[PDB]
Design a protein around this ligand. Structure first.
Ligand SMILES: [Zn+2]
Ligand SMILES: [Zn+2]
Ligand SMILES: [Zn+2]
Ligand SMILES: [Zn+2]
Lengths: 72, 73
DNA sequence: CGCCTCCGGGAGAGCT
DNA sequence: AGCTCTCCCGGAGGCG
């Protein structure tokens, strides 16, 4: 069962308001809080799945917000 | 692995300075911050183990303080 | 990044 | 109507 609304990988539970895997949970916390510089080199449409997750952090962050993920 | 120095059930790790299970963890946090009104019907030496934890919160609370559990400020 | 261990705490069950 | 206890998630720090 257990599927992450962001990357399709196995979800470990509901994190920051959305059902996600472990890696997407910590990717998000780091994206908000830390020093980063993400820029899409595509059209802002990038496919986000387990194999291509690392390719476009900008699109990975975009999908997170659009699913309503947030901090405290 | 890992005993619980207070009730002996099974320890998940160290909580508030002492190696304890999860139920003692949350019992202690609540015993301090709450209106509690616990008192012993024994001689204040009651045995505290998994089967008897619920008998004497007063003594269970004393075992925590004797093991040095605290929060602070 | 992706994963781990460790500790704190909220909340909804369950038990008299 | 309180206590009690497991389940779940958040944050920090470490490591490959
Ligand atoms: Zn994911
Ligand atoms: Zn992109
Ligand atoms: Zn215990
Ligand atoms: Zn007693």
């Amino acid at each position: 069962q257990k599927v992450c609304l962001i990357c399709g990988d196995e979800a470990s539970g509901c994190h920051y308001g959305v059902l996600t895997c472990g890696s997407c949970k910590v990717f998000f916390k780091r994206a908000v809080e830390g020093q980063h510089n993400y820029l899409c080199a595509g059209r802002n449409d990038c496919i986000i799945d387990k194999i291509r997750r690392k390719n476009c952090p900008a699109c990975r962050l975009r999908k997170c917000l659009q699913a309503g993920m947030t901090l405290g």
